[PDB]
Every structure is written in structure tokens, then in C-alpha cells.
Design a protein around this ligand. Structure first.
Ligand SMILES: [Co+2]
Ligand SMILES: [Co+2]
Ligand SMILES: [Co+2]
Length: 299
């Protein structure tokens, strides 16, 4: 139909071995049945860390999105066409990134970043590359989740680490020799804040597009993707943190340049769910502490 619909959503599914009461299992069902995640061509998921809940979610999304990748950094067998980067089978946690699609996935590649804040690789953070055949056309979708802000980051800063991670993504894209007439999208929680930096050509926000050689999309919908002022989980965790705009889906300019590409932030609310933590009961109506970003790409 000459329109590509891609969504990315950091679903906040921390391991239940470390965070027992965040309703991971129930939200796997709520998200899986949610209306906001339907009718897409491809969906990028971030933070699908908990093994049981993530597999449950993927299972719930199987009907509409039967073509799925394994979760970044959880395994390294034939389920991946290639396992690149600093992959380690002994990390305490996986990368929490996965891509599902209603269309056949021709190639699945996982790549683990060389570095992050801290000298050790304890989560195989990185990206997932997919070559997808969407109605007689091959599109390329890379899903990722970049280094978060960390008080401790050695002699380097979170921004410098993210730039290096973005560099690995771009270097991989160039090396792949993808036809320049096919669409190449990079999406996920970049942990790069757009708020108050959209007009600053020197902001980390501006550098993101330069490093990935990507174009800037048209922005619609809500004004933030991690908002403690409207999101129930974010409010619980960080009541006074200003809203931030951290999730994106952008296109490589070294390939097919979309005549139009939009990133819309949605604010879907989930059915009410409750958890008990330290003898105190809490109720929420959000699927995650992050809001999903829905992209419309004209092809
Ligand atoms: Co998070
Ligand atoms: Co895991
Ligand atoms: Co976050």
C-alpha cells in the first residue's frame, strides 16, 4: 500500500528475579491484547528482559505478528543468522531487544555493543537487525536500546558511550551493503533527549542524526515518551523528574529517503492492575513507564 507502519515501545519488563512486583506477567497479557500495538507492519520492543514474561508477550503477539526474532543477547544459536559484537553467554541479563512483524523476516542479526558505562558487559546491550519482505519490497529495521544515564561511567560520559554505540550501528549499516533504494530504519529508546534541544545544532539530539546519517522525522502526538507527569509508573519511580523525549524511529539518508516520515507519541492507558511492594499496594493504568512511538513512513 506504499505505507510502512513501525512502532517501538520500551515495555519495562525487568527481571522478576530482581524486581518481583512490577506486574511483568500481567502486563505481558495486557500489552499483548492492547489496541495500540495492533495494525503495525513491524514492532520493536525494548526492555523485554524477564525471560518468562517476554516469551509470554511474544506469544501473545504471535497471532498478528508471527514473524519474530529471539531476544537480543539471550542465546546465540541458529535462531540468529549472525551473532555480532561483544556477545557473552555468561552475562547476568540479556539485551532485552526484539522485533516482531506481520511480514516474513528474511534475515535476523543480533549485535552486542563494544562498550557501555562500566568495564563489564552484564546485559549484552546492542541492536537487532532485520531484513523484512513487506509486500514485494525489502525493508530493513534495526531495533536498539542505548546506554542510559549513569552517575558512574568511568572517565567517559553516557553521551560519549551512546555516540560510540550509534557509531557501531552506522558502521554495521554501511558494511551491510544494503541497496540505496531500500528503506533502512533505526528505532528504539535512544536515551537521547529532544526536549529543549530541537533547535540546538550542537545538542546530543542533533548529533544522533549526524552519527547515524539519518533524517529528522515530523513529530506528532504527545510531547514526551518518558513522562512522570502523566505516566503512573514513571510517577511512582521518579515523581519530580521532568518529562523527557527519548524514543525514535528514523531513516538512514544513505538509503531510500522517505518523502514523509512521522513519529507519533501515543498515550494508551492499560486496564487497571495492582501489585504489592513491601506491604504496600499500588495500582497502575499504564503498560510501561515509557510511551510507544508510532511511525508512518511513506514509501
Ligand atoms: Co527503563
Ligand atoms: Co532475561
Ligand atoms: Co527510561
Amino acid at each position: 500500500n506504499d505505507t510502512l507502519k513501525v512502532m517501538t515501545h520500551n515495555v519495562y519488563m525487568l527481571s522478576t528475579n530482581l524486581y518481583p512486583n512490577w506486574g511483568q506477567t500481567e502486563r505481558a497479557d495486557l500489552i499483548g491484547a492492547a489496541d495500540y500495538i495492533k495494525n503495525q507492519d513491524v514492532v520493536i520492543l525494548n526492555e523485554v528482559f524477564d525471560n518468562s514474561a517476554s516469551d509470554r508477550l511474544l506469544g501473545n503477539l504471535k497471532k498478528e505478528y508471527p514473524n519474530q526474532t529471539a531476544v537480543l543477547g539471550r542465546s546465540s544459536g541458529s535462531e540468529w543468522d549472525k551473532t555480532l559484537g561483544n556477545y557473552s553467554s555468561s552475562t547476568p541479563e540479556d539485551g532485552g531487544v526484539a522485533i516482531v512483524s506481520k511480514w516474513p523476516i528474511a534475515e535476523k542479526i543480533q549485535y552486542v555493543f563494544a562498550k557501555g558505562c562500566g568495564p563489564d558487559n552484564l546485559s549484552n546491550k546492542g541492536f537487532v537487525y532485520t531484513k523484512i519482505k513487506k509486500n514485494d519490497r525489502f525493508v530493513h529495521v534495526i531495533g536498539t536500546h542505548l546506554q542510559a544515564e549513569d552517575s558512574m561511567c568511568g572517565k567517559t560520559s553516557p553521551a560519549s558511550v551512546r555516540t560510540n554505540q550509534l557509531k557501531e550501528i552506522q558502521d554495521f549499516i554501511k558494511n551491510k551493503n544494503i541497496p540505496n533504494n531500500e528503506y533502512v530504519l533505526i528505532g528504539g529508546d535512544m536515551n537521547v533527549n529532544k526536549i529543549n534541544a530541537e533547535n540546538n545544532n550542537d545538542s546530543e539530539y542533533a548529533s544522533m542524526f549526524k552519527t547515524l546519517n539519518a533524517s529528522v522525522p515530523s513529530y506528532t502526538g504527545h510531547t514526551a515518551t518518558w513522562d512522570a507527569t502523566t505516566n503512573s509508573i514513571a510517577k511512582y519511580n521518579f515523581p519530580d523528574s521532568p518529562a523527557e523525549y527519548l524514543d525514535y524511529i528514523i531513516a538512514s539518508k544513505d538509503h531510500a529517503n522517505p518523502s514523509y516520515i512521522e513519529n507519533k507519541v501515543l498515550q494508551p492507558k492499560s486496564p487497571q492492575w495492582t501489585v504489592t511492594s513491601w506491604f504496600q499496594k499500588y495500582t497502575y493504568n499504564d503498560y510501561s513507564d515509557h510511551y510507544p512511538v508510532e511511525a508512518t513512513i511513506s514509501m
